[model samples]
Target: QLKRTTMRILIGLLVQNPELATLVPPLENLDENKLPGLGLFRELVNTCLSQPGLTTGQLLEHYRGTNNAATLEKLSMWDDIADKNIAEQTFTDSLNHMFDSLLELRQEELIARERTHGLSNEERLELWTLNQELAKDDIPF
Candidate 1:
């Protein structure tokens, strides 16, 4: 879990800047099987902080009551908590941007996957500009 101040600060970065959103993935991209930490972070953003319009404090309070106070505590230091009077639209908009960015990243990953999967080994070699001299110094001694 991130520090509370860091969470608020990071939330600021996520909402305040759209370009940084490229690092975010749609909730669907998260899988506990492969990445529980990512799953937890995603859920924290997608579910825990899903509430819009509430001040940061209100959101924290609500989260502390409903989900996991321990988790929230772990995520926040609370000593330097910022003004919690933020509107829900801010959170919603930021979350939506991340979701949209995630969708784009997902599409890009899929396309890259398809592009590679569609290729034959020979085709891949050609695409990579590979050759025997560059690739095959076959000495398995």
Candidate 2:
């Protein structure tokens, strides 16, 4: 939980800066070690911010509420209670929601990019390959 809160603080700081925010990758869909330049930081911040809540414990609780039984069981093993600062949660939640909105905006940007620079044959082939792989692996996302 403490980790979640720390991540929220870092994400909040980054989102306030356009240059930093632009560097952020899409949520939960990145290979950090293989990312380019500062891309790993961007991906880390994106994943942390995507998890919901502002502070670590609140985020964990939020995850607990949203997760399925299997995931909840996995998360329950972690010890999150180190502090008891309730006020921080409020700020964190507010900022986290704002970040969620920003993600929607980013999605729009992706759509615009797709429209302005439509996919090439190579990109289309790549997509098809990815689709085939996903179908074979039964990946939903």
Candidate 3:
């Protein structure tokens, strides 16, 4: 549902304008398995990083005959309809929203652990750091 929609938007934006991939920071240590389509998203991002100047068709070729082939082809459909500038802005905002959600998820896990067994000194400090980060943006209440 919403997850698939978000992935579609992001991927569509990327397929429409591959140059925007430069703006995506390194997503190290991400739990790609945590989300259904995140692994493909990350793979697409990495592909852009490795090969610059790839065309929409070229990008889709990278995934040809794979499980993600159909999805990439679907994203490529936006080439005729997506406005590069508008999609760029949406891409940036969506990336921020994704990171915010990831932080919130980790925070919730730490809180639950605190309630169940309690946090060690390192974990407590991490929780405080997460609090400060989330507070800066005031996302997710």
Candidate 4:
């Protein structure tokens, strides 16, 4: 949901300032099937990484007559608000947020599944890890 917008903004920022592409971290843990626009986001990121000093127009040209052409075109139009100055921080936070959402979804799925049919050993272990990771930031009030 919110992930798509974050991905869009990240794409716009990358198009505006290609050098910032290196700020993107690897998303190996993310379940690609769960997220809506993650595939496209990763595609753009990989494209930028493969070609150094990529420009907005160059990227648009590269994706022309392809499925991602329209998406790149829209990003080119939104280049004005991409905010190159805050690219580094925004890029980091956006990716982290996506991961957090994934964790939230996984936890919910595990809990719901348990209600219908009890979890297996590995699933229980996963739930424990998920709870630990999700609660890591909390502090006593």
Candidate 5:
């Protein structure tokens, strides 16, 4: 259910900002065996989806150097590669590849944990509520 909700959010963002569609890669390219730290990326996507003023360039800039020190460090190695002036198509493709890798890891981790101990109804509801909250914003998209 969480995966479905996340996908819906991603799809909605891609539809609203067609350019973002170019940033996400095919699911096949994502490795399902590893559980990478993708919650951060998901939050970034949520921010972009909820805030219309947020753009792909802005996200890349944030990842490069921003008040979010943790996020900056997580992607510090990519600092040399970060460039917002590049064509939207290029930026989108790269971003998609990065996100796909991160999300795949997250999904694997979630499933592993779930298999160990399934979520209760209340927990599932809470997760759904959180997703909705993140999806809510006054910003135009």
Candidate 6:
């Protein structure tokens, strides 16, 4: 959990809050120089892991102008990597790869903790309701 959250906060929010890092374990020492490109978003994280001048909201605001879908996509990417490895395995190939396993391990250690991709309960319900409504409109074969 420590390793995951330490990198997680930096990767997720662009803020390397030491206080939050303390909540989790210390990150494993790894050389970032050998890794492949992590694209623009995570490239920002890699560049700023040691320090971030902007909060996540501010950085996302910088990229998206506003809203959190991009953030959700970013987090979910990690979960997927956690669930299964894809592509050439190079130890933390992407930003997601870095903390994905530890994130999964932490959640599992906590008796199957729930993680979300930024959808509030109400928002989830709204999507569910909309899907149900759409389902009703489809013809049954």
| Highest lDDT scorer | 3
Among residues 3 or more apart in sequence or in different chains, the pairs in candidate 1 whose N, CA or C atoms overlap within 3 Å are: 3-75, 4-75, 4-76, 4-77, 52-88, 53-87, 53-88, 55-84
Number of the top candidate by TM-score?
A: 3
Backbone clashes for every candidate come to: 8, 3, 0, 0, 2, 2
Each model's Cα RMSD: 12.9, 14.7, 5.7, 7.5, 14.0, 19.3
Candidate 5 residue lDDT tens string, 1-141: 122123333433332343453354444444433423233444455555555565545655555654444433333333333343543555455455556556445555555666789867865665555546446621111
Over 4 Å off in model 2, which ranges? 1-86, 119-141
Q: Model 4 over residues 45-134: C-alpha lDDT tens digits?
A: 788888988887777677788876766666666644566677778777877787787779999999999999999999999999999987
The C-alpha local distance difference test score for the whole of candidate 5 amounts to 0.45
Per-prediction TM-score: 0.36, 0.26, 0.82, 0.76, 0.31, 0.24
The better candidate by lDDT, 3 or 5, is 3
lDDT of 6: 0.38
Ranking according to lDDT, highest score first: 3, 4, 5, 1, 2, 6
lDDT by residue for model 3 (1-141), tens: 122345567677887778878988887679986655667778888998899999888888888999778667666764433776577778888778777777888899999999999999999999999999878811111
Please state the error at residue 131 of candidate 5 in Å: 34
Better of 3 and 4 by TM-score: 3
Winner by lDDT between candidate 6 and candidate 1: 1
Candidate 3 Cα outliers beyond 4 Å, as residue runs? 1-4, 79-81, 132-141
- lDDT for every model? 0.44, 0.41, 0.76, 0.72, 0.45, 0.38
Output the TM-score of candidate 6. 0.24
- Residue lDDT tens for model 6, 58-125: 44444564344454336434542342233223223433544554444433433322243555576556
Clashing pairs in 6: 2-24, 2-25
Q: Which rank order by TM-score, best down to worst?
A: 3, 4, 1, 5, 2, 6
